[PDB]
Design an enzyme around this catalytic site. Structure first.
Site, PDB file in Angstrom:
ATOM      1  N   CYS A   1     -66.700  46.547  15.677  1.00 61.23           N
ATOM      2  CA  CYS A   1     -67.326  47.034  14.452  1.00 61.23           C
ATOM      3  C   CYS A   1     -66.295  47.336  13.384  1.00 61.23           C
ATOM      4  O   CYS A   1     -65.858  48.485  13.250  1.00 61.23           O
ATOM      5  CB  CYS A   1     -68.090  48.331  14.722  1.00 61.23           C
TER       6      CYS A   1
ATOM      7  N   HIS B   1     -62.313  48.393  16.155  1.00 60.17           N
ATOM      8  CA  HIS B   1     -62.332  47.484  15.035  1.00 60.17           C
ATOM      9  C   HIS B   1     -61.917  46.140  15.593  1.00 60.17           C
ATOM     10  O   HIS B   1     -61.058  46.062  16.477  1.00 60.17           O
ATOM     11  CB  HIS B   1     -61.321  47.898  13.973  1.00 60.17           C
ATOM     12  N   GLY B   2     -62.526  45.089  15.064  1.00 59.26           N
ATOM     13  CA  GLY B   2     -62.196  43.758  15.505  1.00 59.26           C
ATOM     14  C   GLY B   2     -61.080  43.138  14.694  1.00 59.26           C
ATOM     15  O   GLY B   2     -60.915  43.407  13.505  1.00 59.26           O
TER      16      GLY B   2
ATOM     17  N   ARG C   1     -60.673  52.335   8.911  1.00 59.28           N
ATOM     18  CA  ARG C   1     -61.559  53.488   8.789  1.00 59.28           C
ATOM     19  C   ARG C   1     -61.975  54.103  10.124  1.00 59.28           C
ATOM     20  O   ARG C   1     -61.991  53.433  11.149  1.00 59.28           O
ATOM     21  CB  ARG C   1     -62.813  53.111   7.998  1.00 59.28           C
TER      22      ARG C   1
END
Lengths: 226, 242
Positions: A140, A90-91, A31
Protein backbone atom coordinates in the site's frame (compact mmCIF):
# COMPACT_ATOMS: atom_id res chain seq x y z
CA UNK A 1 -6.78 -37.42 -2.24
CA UNK A 2 -4.73 -39.21 -4.91
CA UNK A 3 -2.13 -36.51 -4.31
CA UNK A 4 -4.51 -33.82 -5.56
CA UNK A 5 -4.35 -31.83 -2.34
CA UNK A 6 -1.73 -31.06 0.29
CA UNK A 7 -2.27 -32.95 3.55
CA UNK A 8 -2.76 -30.59 6.49
CA UNK A 9 -3.14 -33.07 9.32
CA UNK A 10 -0.79 -31.65 11.94
CA UNK A 11 -2.07 -29.39 14.73
CA UNK A 12 -0.87 -26.62 14.67
CA UNK A 13 -0.74 -26.40 10.89
CA UNK A 14 2.44 -24.33 10.80
CA UNK A 15 4.28 -21.08 11.47
CA UNK A 16 3.04 -17.72 10.17
CA UNK A 17 5.04 -14.49 10.23
CA UNK A 18 3.38 -11.10 9.70
CA UNK A 19 5.71 -8.19 8.95
CA UNK A 20 3.76 -5.04 9.68
CA UNK A 21 5.53 -1.85 8.58
CA UNK A 22 3.82 1.37 9.67
CA UNK A 23 6.41 4.01 10.58
CA UNK A 24 9.09 5.00 8.11
CA UNK A 25 12.14 7.19 8.62
CA UNK A 26 12.25 10.79 7.36
CA UNK A 27 15.07 10.27 4.85
CA UNK A 28 12.83 7.94 2.84
CA UNK A 29 9.84 10.23 2.60
CA UNK A 30 7.49 7.26 2.84
CA UNK A 31 4.24 8.25 4.58
CA UNK A 32 3.08 6.56 7.78
CA UNK A 33 0.85 3.62 6.98
CA UNK A 34 -1.82 4.33 9.56
CA UNK A 35 -4.64 1.82 9.34
CA UNK A 36 -2.22 -1.04 8.74
CA UNK A 37 -2.60 -2.06 12.40
CA UNK A 38 -6.27 -2.72 11.66
CA UNK A 39 -5.04 -4.87 8.75
CA UNK A 40 -2.48 -6.69 10.86
CA UNK A 41 -5.00 -7.51 13.53
CA UNK A 42 -7.47 -8.90 10.98
CA UNK A 43 -4.80 -11.11 9.45
CA UNK A 44 -3.26 -12.23 12.76
CA UNK A 45 -6.73 -13.17 13.99
CA UNK A 46 -7.37 -14.86 10.63
CA UNK A 47 -4.35 -17.08 10.17
CA UNK A 48 -4.79 -17.97 13.80
CA UNK A 49 -8.21 -19.42 12.91
CA UNK A 50 -6.46 -21.31 10.15
CA UNK A 51 -4.54 -23.02 12.95
CA UNK A 52 -1.17 -21.30 12.56
CA UNK A 53 1.26 -20.10 15.20
CA UNK A 54 1.19 -16.45 14.25
CA UNK A 55 3.99 -14.08 15.16
CA UNK A 56 3.67 -10.37 14.35
CA UNK A 57 6.64 -7.99 14.03
CA UNK A 58 6.33 -4.25 13.56
CA UNK A 59 8.43 -1.61 11.83
CA UNK A 60 11.26 -3.72 10.47
CA UNK A 61 14.26 -2.64 8.46
CA UNK A 62 15.11 -4.29 5.15
CA UNK A 63 18.03 -5.83 6.96
CA UNK A 64 15.90 -6.78 9.96
CA UNK A 65 13.05 -8.11 7.76
CA UNK A 66 15.49 -10.41 6.00
CA UNK A 67 16.91 -11.62 9.33
CA UNK A 68 13.44 -12.38 10.66
CA UNK A 69 12.69 -14.31 7.46
CA UNK A 70 15.93 -16.28 7.66
CA UNK A 71 15.16 -16.86 11.33
CA UNK A 72 11.91 -18.44 10.20
CA UNK A 73 13.50 -20.74 7.64
CA UNK A 74 16.12 -21.82 10.18
CA UNK A 75 13.21 -23.31 12.09
CA UNK A 76 12.33 -27.01 11.98
CA UNK A 77 9.02 -27.28 10.16
CA UNK A 78 9.54 -31.04 10.14
CA UNK A 79 6.27 -32.00 11.84
CA UNK A 80 4.47 -28.96 10.44
CA UNK A 81 2.42 -28.92 7.23
CA UNK A 82 2.64 -25.33 5.95
CA UNK A 83 4.45 -21.99 6.28
CA UNK A 84 3.01 -18.49 5.94
CA UNK A 85 4.55 -15.06 5.54
CA UNK A 86 2.60 -11.82 5.32
CA UNK A 87 4.11 -8.39 4.74
CA UNK A 88 2.30 -5.06 4.98
CA UNK A 89 4.26 -2.09 3.76
CA UNK A 90 4.94 0.36 0.98
CA UNK A 91 5.57 -1.26 -2.35
CA UNK A 92 8.70 -0.80 -4.42
CA UNK A 93 8.23 -0.80 -8.20
CA UNK A 94 11.73 -1.85 -9.21
CA UNK A 95 12.00 -4.24 -12.15
CA UNK A 96 13.63 -7.64 -11.51
CA UNK A 97 15.17 -10.68 -13.12
CA UNK A 98 13.49 -13.70 -11.55
CA UNK A 99 10.35 -12.56 -9.67
CA UNK A 100 8.37 -9.31 -9.62
CA UNK A 101 7.57 -7.34 -6.48
CA UNK A 102 9.36 -5.66 -3.60
CA UNK A 103 8.37 -4.13 -0.28
CA UNK A 104 9.94 -1.32 1.67
CA UNK A 105 11.50 -1.82 5.06
CA UNK A 106 11.19 1.08 7.52
CA UNK A 107 14.65 2.33 6.55
CA UNK A 108 13.51 2.95 2.99
CA UNK A 109 15.43 0.03 1.48
CA UNK A 110 13.62 -2.60 -0.59
CA UNK A 111 13.48 -6.38 -0.20
CA UNK A 112 12.50 -8.07 -3.46
CA UNK A 113 9.86 -10.77 -3.48
CA UNK A 114 12.44 -12.94 -5.23
CA UNK A 115 14.78 -12.76 -2.28
CA UNK A 116 11.96 -13.58 0.11
CA UNK A 117 10.71 -16.56 -1.87
CA UNK A 118 14.18 -18.11 -2.06
CA UNK A 119 14.91 -17.79 1.62
CA UNK A 120 12.27 -20.55 1.76
CA UNK A 121 13.26 -22.84 -1.14
CA UNK A 122 14.33 -26.47 -0.81
CA UNK A 123 18.04 -25.84 -0.30
CA UNK A 124 17.70 -23.03 2.18
CA UNK A 125 14.85 -24.68 4.04
CA UNK A 126 14.87 -28.46 3.59
CA UNK A 127 12.52 -28.59 6.56
CA UNK A 128 9.60 -27.39 4.40
CA UNK A 129 10.46 -29.50 1.35
CA UNK A 130 7.29 -30.69 -0.35
CA UNK A 131 5.15 -28.56 1.98
CA UNK A 132 3.32 -25.42 0.80
CA UNK A 133 5.10 -22.07 1.37
CA UNK A 134 2.59 -19.20 1.15
CA UNK A 135 3.41 -15.52 0.80
CA UNK A 136 0.85 -12.74 1.10
CA UNK A 137 1.94 -9.25 0.18
CA UNK A 138 -0.12 -6.06 0.45
CA UNK A 139 1.96 -3.15 -0.89
CA UNK A 140 0.00 0.00 0.00
CA UNK A 141 2.07 2.90 -1.26
CA UNK A 142 5.76 3.50 -1.84
CA UNK A 143 12.72 -39.08 -4.86
CA UNK A 144 13.55 -35.44 -5.70
CA UNK A 145 11.50 -32.29 -6.10
CA UNK A 146 12.34 -28.99 -7.82
CA UNK A 147 14.19 -26.45 -5.66
CA UNK A 148 11.48 -23.75 -6.19
CA UNK A 149 8.54 -26.13 -5.72
CA UNK A 150 5.46 -25.39 -3.65
CA UNK A 151 5.94 -21.63 -3.70
CA UNK A 152 2.75 -19.54 -3.78
CA UNK A 153 2.56 -15.74 -3.71
CA UNK A 154 -0.50 -13.52 -3.53
CA UNK A 155 0.56 -9.99 -4.41
CA UNK A 156 -1.73 -7.02 -3.88
CA UNK A 157 -1.20 -3.28 -4.35
CA UNK A 158 -4.86 -2.39 -4.22
CA UNK A 159 -5.27 0.98 -2.51
CA UNK A 160 -8.69 1.53 -1.06
CA UNK A 161 -9.89 1.71 2.52
CA UNK A 162 -12.99 0.05 3.96
CA UNK A 163 -14.46 3.55 4.32
CA UNK A 164 -13.32 5.34 1.17
CA UNK A 165 -12.89 8.81 2.71
CA UNK A 166 -10.95 7.50 5.74
CA UNK A 167 -7.34 6.41 5.03
CA UNK A 168 -7.36 4.97 8.53
CA UNK A 169 -10.32 2.64 8.35
CA UNK A 170 -8.07 -0.09 6.95
CA UNK A 171 -7.52 -1.91 3.63
CA UNK A 172 -10.63 -2.84 1.61
CA UNK A 173 -8.50 -5.67 0.27
CA UNK A 174 -7.60 -7.30 3.61
CA UNK A 175 -11.17 -6.87 4.84
CA UNK A 176 -12.54 -8.44 1.65
CA UNK A 177 -10.02 -11.28 1.75
CA UNK A 178 -10.60 -11.79 5.47
CA UNK A 179 -14.34 -11.83 4.90
CA UNK A 180 -14.16 -14.31 2.04
CA UNK A 181 -11.88 -16.68 3.99
CA UNK A 182 -14.24 -16.44 6.97
CA UNK A 183 -17.01 -17.62 4.67
CA UNK A 184 -15.39 -20.18 2.35
CA UNK A 185 -12.03 -21.39 3.67
CA UNK A 186 -13.99 -24.28 5.18
CA UNK A 187 -15.07 -25.63 1.80
CA UNK A 188 -12.91 -23.96 -0.85
CA UNK A 189 -9.17 -24.09 -1.54
CA UNK A 190 -6.66 -21.22 -1.51
CA UNK A 191 -6.76 -20.54 -5.23
CA UNK A 192 -10.57 -20.58 -5.17
CA UNK A 193 -10.70 -18.14 -2.28
CA UNK A 194 -8.26 -15.77 -3.96
CA UNK A 195 -10.33 -15.75 -7.17
CA UNK A 196 -13.37 -14.61 -5.20
CA UNK A 197 -11.15 -11.88 -3.79
CA UNK A 198 -9.78 -10.95 -7.20
CA UNK A 199 -13.32 -10.74 -8.57
CA UNK A 200 -14.61 -8.61 -5.69
CA UNK A 201 -11.68 -6.22 -6.13
CA UNK A 202 -12.19 -5.81 -9.87
CA UNK A 203 -15.87 -5.01 -9.29
CA UNK A 204 -14.73 -2.23 -6.96
CA UNK A 205 -12.19 -0.78 -9.36
CA UNK A 206 -12.59 -1.46 -13.09
CA UNK A 207 -9.17 -0.27 -14.29
CA UNK A 208 -7.64 -0.11 -10.79
CA UNK A 209 -4.79 -2.58 -10.08
CA UNK A 210 -5.99 -6.18 -9.68
CA UNK A 211 -4.21 -8.64 -7.32
CA UNK A 212 -2.12 -11.37 -8.85
CA UNK A 213 -1.10 -14.87 -7.90
CA UNK A 214 2.28 -16.34 -8.74
CA UNK A 215 1.19 -19.97 -8.45
CA UNK A 216 3.84 -22.71 -8.33
CA UNK A 217 2.00 -25.23 -6.17
CA UNK A 218 1.48 -28.86 -7.16
CA UNK A 219 -1.78 -29.53 -5.34
CA UNK A 220 -4.83 -27.73 -4.05
CA UNK A 221 -4.61 -26.27 -0.54
CA UNK A 222 -7.55 -26.61 1.82
CA UNK A 223 -6.89 -24.77 5.06
CA UNK A 224 -7.53 -26.43 8.41
CA UNK A 225 -10.54 -24.77 10.03
CA UNK A 226 -12.96 -25.48 12.88
CA UNK B 1 -27.43 -30.01 -11.09
CA UNK B 2 -24.68 -31.08 -8.71
CA UNK B 3 -21.96 -28.92 -7.17
CA UNK B 4 -19.61 -28.79 -10.17
CA UNK B 5 -22.68 -28.06 -12.30
CA UNK B 6 -23.89 -25.19 -10.14
CA UNK B 7 -20.26 -24.01 -10.16
CA UNK B 8 -19.71 -24.16 -13.89
CA UNK B 9 -22.96 -22.23 -14.19
CA UNK B 10 -22.26 -19.36 -11.79
CA UNK B 11 -21.28 -16.41 -13.97
CA UNK B 12 -19.74 -14.81 -10.89
CA UNK B 13 -17.43 -17.71 -10.17
CA UNK B 14 -16.77 -18.94 -13.69
CA UNK B 15 -16.00 -17.31 -17.04
CA UNK B 16 -18.98 -18.22 -19.20
CA UNK B 17 -17.94 -19.74 -22.53
CA UNK B 18 -21.04 -19.78 -24.73
CA UNK B 19 -19.92 -18.64 -28.17
CA UNK B 20 -19.03 -20.96 -31.02
CA UNK B 21 -16.24 -20.93 -31.86
CA UNK B 22 -14.63 -19.96 -28.57
CA UNK B 23 -12.04 -17.55 -29.91
CA UNK B 24 -8.64 -17.41 -31.53
CA UNK B 25 -5.69 -19.58 -30.66
CA UNK B 26 -2.27 -18.66 -31.95
CA UNK B 27 0.62 -21.09 -31.77
CA UNK B 28 4.10 -19.84 -32.50
CA UNK B 29 6.47 -22.73 -33.02
CA UNK B 30 10.12 -21.81 -33.58
CA UNK B 31 12.37 -24.79 -34.25
CA UNK B 32 15.16 -23.69 -36.60
CA UNK B 33 17.26 -20.84 -35.23
CA UNK B 34 19.96 -18.92 -37.08
CA UNK B 35 23.65 -19.83 -37.09
CA UNK B 36 24.83 -16.62 -35.42
CA UNK B 37 22.44 -17.59 -32.58
CA UNK B 38 24.17 -20.60 -31.08
CA UNK B 39 20.66 -21.82 -30.24
CA UNK B 40 20.03 -25.48 -31.05
CA UNK B 41 17.31 -26.92 -33.30
CA UNK B 42 14.31 -27.61 -31.10
CA UNK B 43 13.83 -31.20 -32.31
CA UNK B 44 10.46 -32.56 -31.24
CA UNK B 45 8.56 -29.25 -31.06
CA UNK B 46 6.51 -30.21 -34.05
CA UNK B 47 4.91 -33.10 -32.21
CA UNK B 48 4.16 -30.65 -29.41
CA UNK B 49 2.90 -28.14 -31.92
CA UNK B 50 0.35 -30.46 -33.49
CA UNK B 51 -0.81 -31.93 -30.20
CA UNK B 52 -1.77 -28.43 -29.15
CA UNK B 53 -3.15 -27.49 -32.54
CA UNK B 54 -5.44 -30.50 -32.23
CA UNK B 55 -6.05 -29.89 -28.55
CA UNK B 56 -7.25 -26.30 -28.83
CA UNK B 57 -9.25 -27.21 -31.91
CA UNK B 58 -10.86 -29.77 -29.65
CA UNK B 59 -11.59 -27.01 -27.13
CA UNK B 60 -13.45 -25.02 -29.82
CA UNK B 61 -10.78 -22.47 -30.70
CA UNK B 62 -9.82 -21.24 -34.15
CA UNK B 63 -6.21 -22.41 -34.21
CA UNK B 64 -3.51 -20.83 -36.36
CA UNK B 65 0.06 -22.14 -36.29
CA UNK B 66 3.00 -20.01 -37.40
CA UNK B 67 6.46 -21.53 -37.39
CA UNK B 68 10.01 -20.17 -37.34
CA UNK B 69 9.43 -16.43 -36.88
CA UNK B 70 12.04 -13.75 -36.24
CA UNK B 71 11.43 -11.75 -33.06
CA UNK B 72 10.05 -8.97 -35.26
CA UNK B 73 7.59 -11.27 -37.00
CA UNK B 74 6.44 -12.63 -33.63
CA UNK B 75 5.47 -9.19 -32.42
CA UNK B 76 3.80 -8.66 -35.80
CA UNK B 77 1.71 -11.80 -35.51
CA UNK B 78 0.78 -10.90 -31.95
CA UNK B 79 -0.09 -7.32 -32.98
CA UNK B 80 -2.38 -8.50 -35.76
CA UNK B 81 -4.10 -10.93 -33.44
CA UNK B 82 -4.88 -8.18 -30.92
CA UNK B 83 -5.75 -5.89 -33.81
CA UNK B 84 -8.67 -8.21 -34.52
CA UNK B 85 -12.30 -8.07 -33.42
CA UNK B 86 -12.87 -10.54 -30.59
CA UNK B 87 -16.36 -9.19 -29.96
CA UNK B 88 -18.17 -12.45 -30.75
CA UNK B 89 -15.52 -14.46 -28.90
CA UNK B 90 -15.12 -15.37 -25.23
CA UNK B 91 -11.44 -16.15 -24.84
CA UNK B 92 -7.99 -15.87 -26.46
CA UNK B 93 -5.10 -18.35 -26.36
CA UNK B 94 -1.49 -17.73 -27.26
CA UNK B 95 1.07 -20.52 -27.26
CA UNK B 96 4.77 -20.04 -27.82
CA UNK B 97 7.22 -22.91 -28.40
CA UNK B 98 10.84 -21.80 -28.47
CA UNK B 99 14.08 -21.04 -26.63
CA UNK B 100 13.84 -18.49 -23.83
CA UNK B 101 15.52 -16.84 -20.87
CA UNK B 102 15.37 -14.33 -18.01
CA UNK B 103 14.49 -10.74 -18.85
CA UNK B 104 14.28 -7.79 -16.51
CA UNK B 105 10.56 -7.39 -15.85
CA UNK B 106 7.98 -5.45 -13.84
CA UNK B 107 5.13 -7.95 -13.78
CA UNK B 108 5.87 -10.98 -16.00
CA UNK B 109 9.18 -12.86 -15.89
CA UNK B 110 11.20 -14.22 -18.80
CA UNK B 111 11.50 -13.75 -22.54
CA UNK B 112 11.30 -15.78 -25.75
CA UNK B 113 13.72 -15.91 -28.71
CA UNK B 114 12.71 -15.14 -32.25
CA UNK B 115 14.20 -17.41 -34.90
CA UNK B 116 16.67 -14.58 -35.52
CA UNK B 117 18.10 -15.05 -32.05
CA UNK B 118 16.53 -11.81 -30.82
CA UNK B 119 14.45 -11.77 -27.58
CA UNK B 120 10.79 -10.81 -27.07
CA UNK B 121 9.72 -10.36 -23.47
CA UNK B 122 6.69 -12.27 -22.17
CA UNK B 123 5.60 -9.03 -20.51
CA UNK B 124 5.59 -7.25 -23.84
CA UNK B 125 3.60 -10.10 -25.35
CA UNK B 126 1.01 -10.11 -22.57
CA UNK B 127 0.71 -6.35 -22.74
CA UNK B 128 0.00 -6.39 -26.46
CA UNK B 129 -3.37 -7.68 -25.29
CA UNK B 130 -4.14 -4.92 -22.76
CA UNK B 131 -7.59 -3.37 -22.48
CA UNK B 132 -6.62 -0.28 -24.49
CA UNK B 133 -4.73 -2.09 -27.23
CA UNK B 134 -7.47 -4.72 -27.51
CA UNK B 135 -10.81 -3.59 -26.01
CA UNK B 136 -12.42 -6.49 -27.88
CA UNK B 137 -11.10 -8.81 -25.14
CA UNK B 138 -11.84 -6.50 -22.22
CA UNK B 139 -12.98 -8.60 -19.29
CA UNK B 140 -12.42 -11.84 -21.20
CA UNK B 141 -9.70 -14.38 -20.34
CA UNK B 142 -6.47 -14.09 -22.35
CA UNK B 143 -4.37 -17.20 -21.86
CA UNK B 144 -0.65 -17.61 -22.53
CA UNK B 145 1.17 -20.93 -22.51
CA UNK B 146 4.92 -20.59 -22.57
CA UNK B 147 7.22 -23.48 -23.38
CA UNK B 148 10.74 -22.02 -23.20
CA UNK B 149 13.72 -22.10 -20.88
CA UNK B 150 12.92 -19.78 -18.02
CA UNK B 151 16.63 -19.46 -17.44
CA UNK B 152 20.07 -21.10 -17.47
CA UNK B 153 20.12 -23.06 -14.20
CA UNK B 154 19.83 -26.84 -14.34
CA UNK B 155 17.92 -27.77 -11.18
CA UNK B 156 19.14 -30.85 -9.22
CA UNK B 157 16.41 -30.56 -6.60
CA UNK B 158 16.36 -32.41 -3.29
CA UNK B 159 15.36 -35.83 -1.94
CA UNK B 160 12.05 -36.09 -0.09
CA UNK B 161 -3.33 2.29 -16.60
CA UNK B 162 -1.38 -0.71 -17.99
CA UNK B 163 -2.58 -3.38 -15.55
CA UNK B 164 -3.04 -7.13 -16.19
CA UNK B 165 -6.65 -8.24 -16.29
CA UNK B 166 -8.04 -11.65 -17.03
CA UNK B 167 -4.48 -12.46 -17.95
CA UNK B 168 -3.22 -15.96 -17.27
CA UNK B 169 0.33 -17.00 -18.08
CA UNK B 170 1.21 -20.68 -17.71
CA UNK B 171 4.96 -21.30 -17.44
CA UNK B 172 6.61 -24.58 -18.35
CA UNK B 173 9.39 -23.90 -15.87
CA UNK B 174 10.08 -21.64 -12.85
CA UNK B 175 11.70 -18.27 -13.83
CA UNK B 176 15.46 -18.69 -13.97
CA UNK B 177 15.51 -22.44 -14.59
CA UNK B 178 15.96 -24.79 -17.55
CA UNK B 179 12.97 -26.37 -19.33
CA UNK B 180 13.47 -29.98 -20.49
CA UNK B 181 12.66 -31.48 -23.88
CA UNK B 182 12.94 -34.89 -25.63
CA UNK B 183 13.82 -35.19 -29.37
CA UNK B 184 11.16 -37.81 -30.11
CA UNK B 185 8.65 -37.36 -27.27
CA UNK B 186 8.52 -33.57 -27.04
CA UNK B 187 8.79 -31.20 -24.08
CA UNK B 188 7.83 -32.64 -20.69
CA UNK B 189 5.37 -29.82 -20.11
CA UNK B 190 3.45 -30.00 -23.38
CA UNK B 191 3.25 -33.77 -23.44
CA UNK B 192 1.98 -33.67 -19.88
CA UNK B 193 -0.45 -30.83 -20.45
CA UNK B 194 -2.03 -32.44 -23.52
CA UNK B 195 -2.28 -35.73 -21.74
CA UNK B 196 -3.96 -34.06 -18.68
CA UNK B 197 -6.24 -31.81 -20.79
CA UNK B 198 -7.20 -35.03 -22.54
CA UNK B 199 -8.30 -36.80 -19.37
CA UNK B 200 -9.79 -33.81 -17.52
CA UNK B 201 -10.63 -30.66 -19.52
CA UNK B 202 -14.21 -31.97 -19.55
CA UNK B 203 -14.60 -31.81 -15.80
CA UNK B 204 -11.93 -29.49 -14.47
CA UNK B 205 -11.07 -25.79 -14.65
CA UNK B 206 -7.90 -24.42 -16.27
CA UNK B 207 -6.01 -23.94 -13.00
CA UNK B 208 -6.89 -27.35 -11.58
CA UNK B 209 -5.60 -28.90 -14.79
CA UNK B 210 -2.26 -27.11 -14.43
CA UNK B 211 -1.70 -28.32 -10.83
CA UNK B 212 -1.99 -31.82 -12.23
CA UNK B 213 0.52 -30.81 -14.92
CA UNK B 214 2.88 -29.22 -12.40
CA UNK B 215 2.55 -32.16 -10.09
CA UNK B 216 3.23 -34.68 -12.86
CA UNK B 217 6.25 -32.88 -14.31
CA UNK B 218 7.74 -32.29 -10.85
CA UNK B 219 8.54 -35.96 -10.33
CA UNK B 220 10.36 -36.32 -13.68
CA UNK B 221 13.94 -36.74 -14.89
CA UNK B 222 17.22 -36.43 -13.05
CA UNK B 223 17.00 -32.69 -13.46
CA UNK B 224 13.93 -31.01 -12.01
CA UNK B 225 11.37 -28.68 -13.54
CA UNK B 226 8.65 -26.78 -11.66
CA UNK B 227 5.79 -25.52 -13.89
CA UNK B 228 3.62 -22.69 -12.64
CA UNK B 229 1.69 -19.64 -13.69
CA UNK B 230 0.95 -15.97 -13.15
CA UNK B 231 -2.76 -15.85 -12.55
CA UNK B 232 -4.58 -12.54 -12.92
CA UNK B 233 -7.91 -14.20 -13.61
CA UNK B 234 -11.12 -13.30 -11.78
CA UNK B 235 -12.96 -16.58 -12.19
CA UNK B 236 -12.52 -20.26 -12.88
CA UNK B 237 -12.22 -21.30 -16.51
CA UNK B 238 -13.88 -24.41 -17.91
CA UNK B 239 -13.17 -25.08 -21.58
CA UNK B 240 -15.86 -25.96 -24.10
CA UNK B 241 -15.34 -29.70 -24.64
CA UNK B 242 -16.21 -31.98 -27.59
Amino acid sequence: NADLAYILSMEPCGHCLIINNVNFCRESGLRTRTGSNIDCEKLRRRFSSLHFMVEVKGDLTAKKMVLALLELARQDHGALDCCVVVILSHGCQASHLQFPGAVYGTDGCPVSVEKIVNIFNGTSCPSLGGKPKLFFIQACGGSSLPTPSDIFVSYSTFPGFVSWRDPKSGSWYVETLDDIFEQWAHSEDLQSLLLRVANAVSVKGIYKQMPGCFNFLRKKLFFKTS
